[PDB]
């Protein structure tokens, strides 16, 4: 149903993911670092790409929640690992 592909430019202070949800589109996508108590809003880019720019270094694994345009809300824990690979697709 839902996949997260790590996009180029992703580094310790920038996470870029191509999010593809089958039969729907993302209205909002958020991430939470394994260590972190707070969800952070990602910014919608072109072609399903969502990005987050961090003041401090980001450390995965990364949890995501989202809201689809049709109104579906979900959360997926530890979808993208700490030591992720750019170009790799991660799925629940």
């Amino acid at each position: 149903k839902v996949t997260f592909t790590v996009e180029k430019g992703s580094n310790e202070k920038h996470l870029a993911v191509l999010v593809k949800y089958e039969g729907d589109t993302m209205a909002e996508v958020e991430l939470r670092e394994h260590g972190s108590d707070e969800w952070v809003a990602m910014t919608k880019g072109e072609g399903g790409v969502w990005t987050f720019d961090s003041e401090e270094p980001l450390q995965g694994p990364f949890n995501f929640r989202f809201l689809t345009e049709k109104g579906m809300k979900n959360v997926f824990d530890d979808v993208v690992p700490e030591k992720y690979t750019i170009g790799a697709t991660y799925a629940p």
Partner: antibody
């Protein structure tokens, strides 16, 4: 999707309170949700116990975490709570609930547990 | 930790009254804000999410507003079955902190 609490309504002090929540109309193994336990003690508000992701990740109320163990069983489509070393302060109505990342949209009916004899 | 504080603690209002209940977050939480109704002996019921979205099947008399710190649940025309405790809840943090509850009683 529907949730139903089951387990003893009477637990002896210092023993473990065990409850299970049976999920129907949906598969826990599919992911997408945190599976939650929330309770209410008599004159008090709603208190978080904790929540668990089906992969195993668990999030506990810090004031209870030492006594709390939650589990999930994907094969039986249920998730459970064990709260050790209970006292009368754990007498409460215990609710299981589904958390979609944002909201607790589906709840069980609640089950009373009296810490006992 | 985020603290969620509701006002008033309790109120009595008549059938047909417009009733409002407030919820204040200790830090900015945008619209990461839900409202629940809890009738004793029943499961809590999600009324509102994302500050102003009405949960499917919840009656139209319930509405929500606000952004950031101060939020308001409105019951546009109170019905006698609406006595309950009502709870806000933040969804910015992984604690999903509940407010302390506001008890609504029916004046007659």
């Amino acid at each position: 999707v529907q949730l139903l609490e089951s387990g003893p309504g009477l637990v002896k002090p210092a023993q473990t309170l065990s409850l299970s929540c049976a999920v129907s109309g949906g598969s826990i193994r599919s992911g997408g949700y945190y599976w939650s336990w929330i309770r209410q003690h008599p004159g008090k508000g709603l208190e978080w116990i904790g929540y668990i992701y089906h992969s195993g990740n668990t999030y506990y109320n810090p004031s209870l975490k030492s006594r709390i163990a939650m589990s999930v069983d994907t094969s039986e489509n249920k998730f459970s709570l064990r709260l050790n070393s209970v006292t009368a302060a754990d007498t409460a109505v215990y609710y299981c609930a589904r958390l979609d990342g944002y909201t607790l949209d589906i709840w069980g009916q609640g089950t009373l547990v009296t810490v006992s004899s | 930790e985020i603290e969620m504080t509701q006002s008033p603690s309790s109120l009595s209002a008549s059938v047909g009254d417009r009733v409002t209940i407030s919820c204040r977050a200790s830090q900015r939480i945008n619209t990461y804000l839900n409202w629940y109704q809890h009738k004793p002996g029943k499961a809590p019921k999600l009324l509102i999410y994302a500050a102003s979205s009405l949960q499917s099947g919840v009656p139209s008399r319930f509405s929500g507003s606000g952004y950031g710190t101060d939020f308001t649940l409105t019951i546009s025309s109170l019905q006698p079955e609406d006595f309950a405790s009502y709870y806000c809840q933040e969804s910015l943090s992984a604690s999903y902190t509940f407010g302390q509850g506001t008890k609504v009683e029916i004046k007659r």
